[PDB]
Design a protein around this nucleic acid. Structure first.
Lengths: 58, 148, 185, 222, 159, 50, 51
RNA sequence: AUGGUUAUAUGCCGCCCGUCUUGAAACACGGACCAAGGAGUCUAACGUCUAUGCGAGUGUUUGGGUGUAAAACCCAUACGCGUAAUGAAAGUGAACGUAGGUUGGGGCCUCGCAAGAGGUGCACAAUCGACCGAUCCUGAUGUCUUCGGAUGGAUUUGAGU
RNA sequence: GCUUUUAGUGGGCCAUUUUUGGUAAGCAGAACUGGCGAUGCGGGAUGAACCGAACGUAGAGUUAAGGUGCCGGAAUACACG
RNA sequence: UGAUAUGAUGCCCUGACGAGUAGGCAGGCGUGGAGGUCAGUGACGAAGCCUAGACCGUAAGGUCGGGUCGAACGGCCUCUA
């Protein structure tokens, strides 16, 4: 009772039925996995420049 | 009703929506939760992680009346004053005439401080209070009286 | 013999009539189909599309969500339009004087809005007050705060609230959920 | 509200000024075409007299007819044929000749026949099979206002404005050509002239560069 | 049995490019990679630490995380009917900047300058690129260049 | 037998459950007969509360 | 309602393209060219009839 | 008379259906013929979607009152689910702030003949934070001197705010 | 652009080109594309896959592949062997 | 959507498209019974049955004439199996 083992037939015709999709890039990508010593400080860089810009509307 | 059912639409067509090759059989993969670790493993992980195994300690004869402690947030807490007296007590926000709020008779075991009561002094009859529920109640000029 | 670049006979995918048989709702669609066709105002093309929506797709707008929307700058005197249901919020203790137009108000929302001296009008009184959508502010409720969308996209490492009847210890908290029992999602 | 002729005579007068503009611009177009062809003939003769060879300019525009049907097409020429708006057999388009289109034509060569169309072929094509893409809905041209309300942003406001933006390939060739719905040509009236269509025109078939003889195709297929 | 290890089918890929073996030159360690730089991945065979998989050889992505002896590179991977975003912590010996972005940033300075020069002199800038346009008409002279008549050649063996 | 993102159900129907189904059709009937029993008791116990 | 052909149906040929009325006037498609008596160079003929 | 139906003649075409199968007219299986019967149903618990009533609530119908009597109508207290989560548990328990900052964002508002500029931006999407629980670290005033756990954190964690 | 939900399916086969085992096979197994399955029409007499071309009901015209002595619609056409 | 004439799920203009197994969805045809209605049909002939007789619908089917027959049965709006 032998049979076919493997084929890549129809797999590209299948993948292009729904038209192989791009990963939809964003502005402000995620800081996940970015170096934590940079990422720790970047919290304080953003918080300080929000305090300084809200100070412009005192 | 059976009039609006898709079995009235497979009259005439042979396999009744079940396929020629598939040939709808009685139990092709088992019965019920059968084979969750063997041939239904890719469904068990991915949509039910954590199913198999043991966590924690057993509680012989657990009664869920010992653990009766429904929570009430500082969000509402004025719904336990009726509406005809709610506008009366909200104005004249002062001590020596302060609304006693019976939270246990209202059906709550614990007061929690989710946020922003008005600055009226109130009297809270509670069993359990959190930290922040007591701090915000006292910052409005009220107290909490623990009862049983 | 045509090499088709797209699916033939495809519908638009959007609602053109509401699925309901609410006769007063279809009179509101009859009013706003007229106004979207013959006024060229961008407002009326929005309200007509919103009048079609299903009960999931029009979540209730709280009355405290409205009072937050009038705290926007310049929006203190705008007519807030809610295509759906205005619900009361006991967590807000001061409500402004504004006018609200909506499909339905609950008996607590209407009692709160008129208590501050506002008016609860309907969507056709709005279209007599403002046919082109003058001085309005369309508010929509939170769509992704239902219980069902917790479970949408359930998979490994996605954290999407497994479909389960009973919740606590010994119901899906074990092998697959902590590192001490095999693997962790 | 008068409106019987208080606006009707104004509309008739405005259409008359439009029609005078179209008349003088078509006269300018005709004079330019005639001087262009005479000047190429005289450059040829005045190079032959001078002991030289006037090479012509390379052709800036081809007309392409899809020659093969729908079935059994590989994905790359099928994708290019979808991009050149040739989605059925015996359909044609005008293509501006650059390298980025020469390589497309070299890709779909065993499925199309193309060449260099004259003024007269373009003229008969837009006059008989000329259709526009107006909210798309395939509107026949049939009147100069149909062209003007869709291409007056580029200056084109008549049918010879369309032909002039095709043949002389203009600064607005892309918009004027994308406006034209692809020409649903018929089969040729004289036949194809070959027993077997699907070899090259050099090998005695139909596909490939059929250069000036593309007119002999299209005027029978139009 | 089959073998599908981490470095299977890489006989010639991580080979070290004949008569350029040995240690690597020091301008590999002196490039400055900033977050957003477009890099090319070519795995150095002699540095076994921090190598990419053989899929990512010749793949081009952007830098997302810059640390001590490596950078984090974002690569799109074609898998199924979608693309996934892949994150690679690769040492800087297996990497170099792209020159195709050096096509871009130098053409940005050219395009922005030609817009300013045309603004002062006669706008109609015309600062797009154009494809290879076909050739113009010209007159080629036969003076000193009388055409030689070439005929086809008979068959000869010559072995 | 386990296929979709559906919650794991516990339907305890593996016994002979169909032999022990008690549908309460006599809810109205037992209500009427119970009111009649209370009326008869109030008649027998004639001056007293129920 | 119906597509009238130009290049026959002279009225629709006149509705489009108002130049056509004068294209039949001066006839403009059977115009003669001006006769110019230039002869080719000798070297052109030598390379034409060369063996 | 045209036309329609019907039988027949003529020209060309047309292999028994159903089924399993890569492939059935098959030298594969069932089918002599006819009439009637004949196969995705109901229930318990659920997923998505939709419609409807109400809405931080909701669900009268276990039961009671009633009745023209298995209908209809009316109702108290409970309880179920929801409004709080997280931990194995003891337990603890959701605002620094216009309930945050940025990037888009329909709609509305102001100027304009328009093109456009600016303001406000619901939902939704991306991001950086803040809050609550668990884990790990820190251990203030105090102390039945070993209890207490303030304050501050952390590439940790949650089916949360 | 995005999301949910669910059916059937998870025996395949052939053709061009590349290619493995085999003396080979209407053999066994791969790669890419196109087909058949799932598909009728014109041609190859006949045939699942080849060639042409993909199909609502009709009318007119033109052709594709294939053909034009007769069966058989269409030259016992013309030209050089 | 402006009435004083009736379909706004309407009517009308415009363009393109139409193969199909397994399968999904939609609009309908028919049957047994239930609620409402047509103050419906009917011993002066209901239902049924027969009818190379007619009409409508792409179709599921519906309608009419003639014969036979003798006691009940349909159209429409919904419910149900």
């Amino acid at each position: 009772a032998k049979s076919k083992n493997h084929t890549a037939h129809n797999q590209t015709r299948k993948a292009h039925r729904n038209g192989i999709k791009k990963p939809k890039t964003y502005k402000y990508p995620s800081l996940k996995g970015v170096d934590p010593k940079f990422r720790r400080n970047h919290k304080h860089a953003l918080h300080g420049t929000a305090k300084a810009l809200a100070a412009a509307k005192k | 009703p059976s009039r609006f059912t898709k079995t009235r639409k497979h009259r005439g067509h042979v396999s009744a929506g079940k396929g020629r090759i598939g040939k709808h059989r009685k139990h092709p993969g088992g019965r019920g939760m059968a084979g969750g670790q063997h041939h239904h493993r890719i469904n068990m992980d991915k949509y039910h992680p954590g199913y198999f195994g043991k966590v924690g300690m057993r509680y012989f004869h657990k009664q869920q009346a010992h653990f009766w402690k429904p929570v009430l947030n500082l969000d509402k807490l004025w719904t336990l004053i009726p509406e005809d007296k709610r506008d009366q007590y909200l104005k004249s926000a002062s001590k020596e005439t302060a609304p006693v709020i019976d939270t246990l008779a209202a059906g709550y075991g614990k007061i929690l401080g989710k946020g922003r009561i008005p600055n009226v002094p109130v009297i809270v009859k509670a069993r359990f209070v959190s930290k922040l529920a007591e701090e915000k109640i006292r910052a409005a000029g009220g107290v909490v009286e623990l009862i049983a | 013999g045509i090499d088709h670049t797209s699916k033939q006979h495809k519908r638009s995918g959007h609602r053109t009539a509401p699925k309901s048989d609410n006769v007063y709702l279809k009179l509101l669609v009859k009013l706003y189909t007229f106004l979207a066709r013959r006024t060229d105002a961008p407002f009326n093309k929005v309200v007509l599309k919103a009048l079609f929506l299903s009960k999931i797709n029009r979540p209730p707008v709280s009355v405290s969500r409205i009072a937050r929307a009038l705290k926007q700058e310049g929006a203190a005197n705008k007519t807030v339009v809610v295509v759906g249901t205005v619900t009361d919020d006991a967590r807000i203790f001061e409500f402004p004087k504004t006018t609200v137009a909506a499909l339905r108000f609950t008996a607590g929302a209407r009692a709160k809005i008129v208590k501050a001296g506002g008016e609860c009008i309907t969507l056709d009184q709005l279209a007599v007050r403002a046919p082109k959508g003058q001085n309005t502010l369309i508010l929509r409720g939170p769509r992704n705060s239902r219980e069902a969308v917790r479970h949408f996209g359930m998979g490994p490492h996605k954290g999407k609230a497994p479909r389960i009847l009973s919740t606590g210890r010994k119901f899906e908290r074990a092998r697959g959920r902590r590192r001490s029992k095999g693997f962790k999602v | 509200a008068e409106q019987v002729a208080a606006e009707r005579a104004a509309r008739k007068a405005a259409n008359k000024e439009k029609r005078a503009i179209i008349l003088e611009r078509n006269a300018a177009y005709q004079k330019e075409y005639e001087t262009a062809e005479r000047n190429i003939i005289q450059a040829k003769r005045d190079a032959k007299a001078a002991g030289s060879y006037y090479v012509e300019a390379q052709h800036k525009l081809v007309f392409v007819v899809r020659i093969k049907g729908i079935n059994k097409i590989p994905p790359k020429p099928r994708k290019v044929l979808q991009l050149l708006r040739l989605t059925r057999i015996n359909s044609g388009t005008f293509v501006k000749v650059t390298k980025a289109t020469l390589e497309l034509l070299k890709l779909i060569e065993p499925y199309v026949a193309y060449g260099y169309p004259s003024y007269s072929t373009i003229r008969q094509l837009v006059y008989k099979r000329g259709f526009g893409k107006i909210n798309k809905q395939r509107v026949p041209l049939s009147d100069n206002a149909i062209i003007e309300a869709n291409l007056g942003k580029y200056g084109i406001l008549s049918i010879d404005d369309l032909i002039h933006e095709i043949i002389t390939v203009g600064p607005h060739f892309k918009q004027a050509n994308n406006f034209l719905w692809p020409f649903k040509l018929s089969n040729p009236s004289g036949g194809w002239g070959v027993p077997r269509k699907f070899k090259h025109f050099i090998q005695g078939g139909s596909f490939g560069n059929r250069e000036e003889f593309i007119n002999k195709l299209v005027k029978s297929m139009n | 049995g089959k073998s599908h290890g981490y470095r299977s089918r890489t006989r010639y890929m991580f080979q070290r490019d004949f008569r350029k073996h040995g240690a690597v030159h020091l301008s590999t360690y002196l490039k400055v990679y900033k977050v957003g730089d477009i890099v090319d991945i070519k795995a150095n065979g002699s540095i076994q630490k921090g190598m990419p998989h053989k899929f990512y050889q010749g793949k081009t992505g952007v830098v997302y995380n810059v640390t001590k002896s490596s950078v984090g590179v974002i690569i799109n991977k074609m898998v199924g009917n979608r693309y996934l975003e892949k994150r690679l912590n690769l040492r800087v010996e297996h990497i170099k900047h792209s020159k195709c972005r050096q096509e871009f940033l130098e053409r940005v300075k050219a395009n922005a300058a030609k817009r300013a020069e045309a603004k002062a002199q006669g706008v109609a800038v015309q600062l797009k690129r154009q494809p290879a346009q076909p050739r113009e008409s010209r007159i080629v002279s036969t003076e000193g260049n009388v055409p030689q008549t070439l005929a086809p050649v008979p068959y000869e063996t010559f072995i | 037998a386990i296929s979709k993102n559906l919650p794991i159900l516990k339907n305890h129907f593996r016994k002979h459950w169909q032999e022990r189904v008690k549908v309460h059709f006599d809810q109205a009937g037992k209500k009427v007969s119970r009111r009649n029993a209370r009326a008869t008791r109030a008649a027998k116990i004639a001056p007293r509360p129920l | 309602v119906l597509k009238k052909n130009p290049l026959k149906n002279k009225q629709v040929l006149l509705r489009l393209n108002p130049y056509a009325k004068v294209f039949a006037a001066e006839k403009l498609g059977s115009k003669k060219a001006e006769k110019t008596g230039t002869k080719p160079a000798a070297v052109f003929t030598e390379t034409l009839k060369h063996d």
